[PDB]
Protein backbone atom coordinates (compact mmCIF):
# COMPACT_ATOMS: atom_id res chain seq x y z
CA UNK A 1 0.00 0.00 0.00
CA UNK A 2 2.95 2.29 -0.26
CA UNK A 3 5.50 0.43 -1.84
CA UNK A 4 7.23 -2.00 -4.16
CA UNK A 5 8.32 -5.11 -1.84
CA UNK A 6 11.20 -5.81 -3.91
CA UNK A 7 12.43 -8.95 -2.81
CA UNK A 8 15.75 -10.59 -4.40
CA UNK A 9 16.09 -13.66 -6.25
CA UNK A 10 18.00 -15.21 -3.07
CA UNK A 11 14.98 -14.45 -0.52
CA UNK A 12 12.54 -16.08 -2.81
CA UNK A 13 14.43 -18.82 -3.72
CA UNK A 14 14.21 -20.31 0.26
CA UNK A 15 10.45 -20.53 -0.28
CA UNK A 16 9.64 -23.75 -0.87
CA UNK A 17 10.14 -25.69 1.88
CA UNK A 18 6.80 -26.10 4.09
CA UNK A 19 4.22 -23.63 4.09
CA UNK A 20 5.34 -20.50 2.68
CA UNK A 21 5.61 -21.22 -1.12
CA UNK A 22 5.97 -18.12 -3.43
CA UNK A 23 5.77 -17.96 -6.97
CA UNK A 24 6.88 -15.27 -9.60
CA UNK A 25 4.82 -14.06 -12.81
CA UNK A 26 6.05 -11.27 -15.11
CA UNK A 27 8.78 -9.29 -12.75
CA UNK A 28 6.02 -9.99 -9.80
CA UNK A 29 6.43 -12.01 -6.69
CA UNK A 30 2.94 -13.47 -6.03
CA UNK A 31 2.51 -14.79 -2.66
CA UNK A 32 0.47 -18.41 -2.85
CA UNK A 33 1.19 -19.25 0.65
CA UNK A 34 -3.07 -19.37 1.12
CA UNK A 35 -3.65 -20.49 -2.45
CA UNK A 36 -2.32 -23.76 -2.41
CA UNK A 37 -4.93 -26.39 -1.86
CA UNK A 38 -7.60 -23.57 -2.71
CA UNK A 39 -5.80 -23.15 -5.97
CA UNK A 40 -8.67 -24.87 -8.88
CA UNK A 41 -5.80 -27.33 -9.87
CA UNK A 42 -4.39 -29.20 -6.80
CA UNK A 43 -1.55 -27.87 -4.46
CA UNK A 44 1.42 -29.13 -5.51
CA UNK A 45 1.71 -27.69 -9.27
CA UNK A 46 2.09 -24.42 -7.80
CA UNK A 47 4.81 -25.63 -5.71
CA UNK A 48 6.35 -27.10 -9.25
CA UNK A 49 7.79 -23.31 -9.80
CA UNK A 50 8.14 -22.11 -6.20
CA UNK A 51 10.74 -19.32 -5.37
CA UNK A 52 11.83 -19.01 -9.06
CA UNK A 53 10.48 -19.12 -12.85
CA UNK A 54 6.65 -19.82 -12.88
CA UNK A 55 5.98 -16.82 -15.76
CA UNK A 56 6.27 -19.35 -18.45
CA UNK A 57 4.42 -22.13 -16.20
CA UNK A 58 1.59 -20.20 -15.96
CA UNK A 59 0.68 -17.80 -18.97
CA UNK A 60 0.89 -21.39 -21.52
CA UNK A 61 -1.82 -22.64 -18.97
CA UNK A 62 -4.02 -19.37 -20.50
CA UNK A 63 -6.11 -19.47 -17.49
CA UNK A 64 -8.74 -17.18 -18.61
CA UNK A 65 -9.09 -12.96 -19.23
CA UNK A 66 -11.25 -12.84 -15.57
CA UNK A 67 -8.66 -15.00 -12.87
CA UNK A 68 -5.11 -13.79 -13.91
CA UNK A 69 -6.35 -10.38 -12.75
CA UNK A 70 -7.16 -11.78 -9.41
CA UNK A 71 -3.51 -12.37 -9.21
CA UNK A 72 -3.04 -9.38 -8.28
CA UNK A 73 -4.34 -9.17 -5.00
CA UNK A 74 -1.85 -11.62 -4.16
CA UNK A 75 1.54 -9.32 -5.49
CA UNK A 76 3.52 -9.35 -2.16
CA UNK A 77 5.99 -7.27 -4.49
CA UNK A 78 8.48 -8.13 -7.36
CA UNK A 79 12.01 -8.61 -8.75
CA UNK A 80 14.72 -6.16 -6.50
CA UNK A 81 15.87 -3.76 -9.15
CA UNK A 82 19.39 -4.46 -8.32
CA UNK A 83 19.18 -8.22 -10.00
CA UNK A 84 16.54 -6.85 -11.94
CA UNK A 85 18.48 -3.99 -13.65
CA UNK A 86 20.43 -6.74 -14.65
CA UNK A 87 17.19 -8.30 -17.20
CA UNK A 88 18.67 -6.49 -19.51
CA UNK A 89 21.30 -8.65 -20.30
CA UNK A 90 20.57 -12.33 -19.25
CA UNK A 91 23.74 -13.08 -19.12
CA UNK A 92 22.17 -13.86 -15.94
CA UNK A 93 24.82 -15.44 -14.54
CA UNK A 94 24.98 -16.45 -12.09
Same mark, same amino acid.
Given at each position: DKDVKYYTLEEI???????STWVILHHKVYDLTKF? &? *????? &? *?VLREQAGGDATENFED???STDARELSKTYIIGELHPDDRSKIAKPSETL
Open positions: QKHKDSKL &E *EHPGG &E *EVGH
